[PDB]
Nucleic acid binder design. Structure first.
Lengths: 386, 386
DNA sequence: TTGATCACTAGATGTTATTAAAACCTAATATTTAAGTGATGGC
DNA sequence: GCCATCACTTAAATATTAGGTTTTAATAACATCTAGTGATCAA
């Protein structure tokens, strides 16, 4: 017996009004399916949101514990397990996802096998185990039948494009996605709509269409109850304001932090966004992570020191950074910081170069802003953002 | 009997020294395979360069007529037909290519079928009949066996990226290509090496690494006897010099013009390049096409007039142009010309904006060069090329 | 009588098992190639 | 002579075929779901 079923039986003992409340939370017209759920092993809901919405309404702080136990006991050959796979991936519950994938790829239900194989390609691609070319050839070789995996085969590519700064094919590919063709799995259909909204938001951020960016993140927020998408929406909204409005950026990052303070990963993401924000605006910075040796966190240390004319401490931190293997995006920040410290325009030109090499039309604002304050032609600097 | 065989028999009648000359032109140690070629229907050469090199040496002005007749009589189940397919594609002989493809996709030799299907995807992709996504899914579904089609499956993608200005995935993909794995078809192997050189040249041009660009096109030239690659290599070399080195750009364009002035496809290419060159350098310009009413040719007219302070003739030409439907690229030149004529910088900023909207990293050099000559920050202008 | 619990139901959704027909190896068998050899035969 | 022509030839590189898997597609057979119904049992 699954943890969720035991917990629902206990709360029923203490309060016999619950089954009609839970039925409406689950989108059911009467609670007869809930009685069967508690009394009979292996009984699933036709739509996965029935159980997800009860867990979020009744056991919000135990979602992981309960849904992990529930998902990992599911018969992998069912619609419910297919829904669990998307649930796991959307919530970034990767230990759950990878176990589901590994038993779905070997099962004899053809739909579950296809979903499992498609999500495995996504996991392999997002972890740089395979190239984009290899991934899409594998997708073609699968002979995809379901409208669900037809849509996700495009979404997983869009995530790869985003993670590698390859924005130009994104607009055309995202337009091909047709969620209206999905008729079996409404849980997946609705979570994919959320994913589309957040991807559209990130594309607009990249195009520097900042109002549209916010409108898409707001659509994402209205369409979801999933923490991961709420987190990345607030992060995107805040990022879209980072160079123009300290207080509104801060409000979005503090909102994100307040909903995610209990999760170490999301906590640290908002701490890092607040840290970046306070360094951009040259304020005192309580968010600096002196314990990290990652490139990102050391750069913020240096930035804060330079902001306060603590040049030996800044130089110490850059000497530590000189000894590390930077990617192009990392190098661009490195040159921005060296430029601020040494007060040397040449570094800002290299910083801009490396931001252009990493297709970053966002943080490039840092060296552009310095050159603006050094008196360079504003029109040229605006044209460099394009 | 194929036309080439009849022609070779005729020239033998008039001059009985030819078979040993032809054997060495064909890379053969003795001419016994040539005797068999003339005397026995369906006898092919182990390497397709044997026949191609004879045709280019003895019948240079009849290459199309002869090779068309030869290719279209070939048994499509052979190595020779597979070579002919690449020959047709490299030379842009599309009527020949599409007939070969159509009989190869239906034939019962598994290698020819594979080559035929891969080239069909290439033809469909380069004609925008399918998307890149659909193309590579089809490639994966083919289950490619041959090293040749493994390499070409990457090359055909690289061409798509190039034609759509999507340069960022090019460097990573081209590195995966491994020509040393090809052991069967040396004609294909060597033509693909040429193709790699010219793609490398275009990648470097896009990165604004102009010396490297030239080095790759020069390697392409030395590796080929195929007019298409010679043409596009001289065009690229000259284009890489257009804004910086008049005499060298001119020399490359005149070479290109020399080899292509007789040929309807390519003739105009170098006339247009010479026209652009002479307008950039503000010289007398015999290459202006007053007979065209295309937007590009009228813009060149206006440019030449403004270069010589012929302002009423320039205004006449712009009044004609005002009345036409411009795309973004055309608008960018429109603003460049307005800028030169009316002598204000503001127009050069709009010109640059519109070049950036049409992803043109080439003609953008026109307004950048004016701003450079007006004394603006050269580093910023260089950074605008990226 | 309320109301909670639960096993029935029907009809729509989902899942599995059965085929037959395509497709894919692969390894034997057979064919075709380049480049020596030696026969004609016209000078 | 001695040189062009060209059928043999060898062994290496190519092409074909026939077979037995495996893969794929379609659908008939089976099962599970929601949301009504009506039984108990408890006030």
């Amino acid at each position: 017996m699954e943890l969720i079923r035991i917990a629902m039986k206990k709360d029923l003992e203490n309060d016999n009004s619950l089954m009609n409340k839970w039925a409406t939370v689950a989108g059911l017209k009467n609670p007869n399916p809930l009685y069967d759920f508690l009394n009979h092993d292996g009984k699933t809901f036709n739509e996965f949101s029935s159980i997800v919405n009860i867990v979020k309404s009744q056991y919000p702080d135990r979602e992981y514990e309960l849904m992990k136990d529930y998902c990992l006991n599911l018969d992998v050959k069912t619609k419910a397990a297919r829904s669990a796979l998307e649930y796991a991936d959307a919530n970034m519950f990767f230990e759950i996802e990878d176990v589901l994938i590994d038993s779905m790829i070997s099962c004899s239900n053809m739909k579950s096998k296809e979903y499992g194989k498609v999500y495995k390609i996504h996991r392999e691609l997002s972890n740089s185990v395979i190239t984009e070319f290899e991934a899409v050839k594998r997708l073609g070789k699968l002979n995809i039948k379901t409208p669900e995996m037809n849509s996700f085969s495009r979404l997983l590519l869009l995530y790869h494009y985003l993670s590698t700064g390859n924005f130009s094919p994104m607009a055309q590919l995202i337009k091909q996605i047709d969620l209206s063709e999905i008729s079996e799995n409404m849980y997946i259909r609705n979570t994919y709509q959320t994913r589309v909204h957040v991807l559209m938001s990130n594309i607009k951020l990249n195009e520097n269409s900042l109002e549209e960016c916010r409108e898409y993140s707001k659509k994402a927020l209205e369409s979801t109850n999933i923490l991961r998408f709420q987190v990345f929406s607030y992060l995107t909204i805040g990022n879209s304001l980072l160079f123009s409005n300290y207080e509104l950026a801060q409000e979005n990052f503090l909102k994100g932090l307040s909903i995610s303070v209990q999760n170490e990963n999301y906590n640290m993401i908002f701490q890092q966004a607040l840290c970046f924000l306070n360094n951009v605006w040259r304020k005192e910075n309580k968010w600096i992570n002196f314990e990290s040796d990652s490139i990102m966190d050391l750069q913020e240390q240096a930035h804060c020191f330079i902001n306060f004319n603590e040049n030996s401490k800044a130089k110490e931190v850059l000497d530590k950074l000189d000894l590390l293997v930077h990617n192009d995006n990392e190098l661009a920040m490195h040159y921005y910081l060296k430029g601020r410290l040494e007060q040397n325009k040449a570094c800002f030109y290299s910083s801009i170069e490396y931001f252009k090499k990493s297709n970053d039309k966002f943080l490039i604002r840092l060296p552009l802003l310095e050159l603006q304050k050094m008196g360079e032609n504003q029109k040229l600097l605006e044209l460099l953002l394009l």
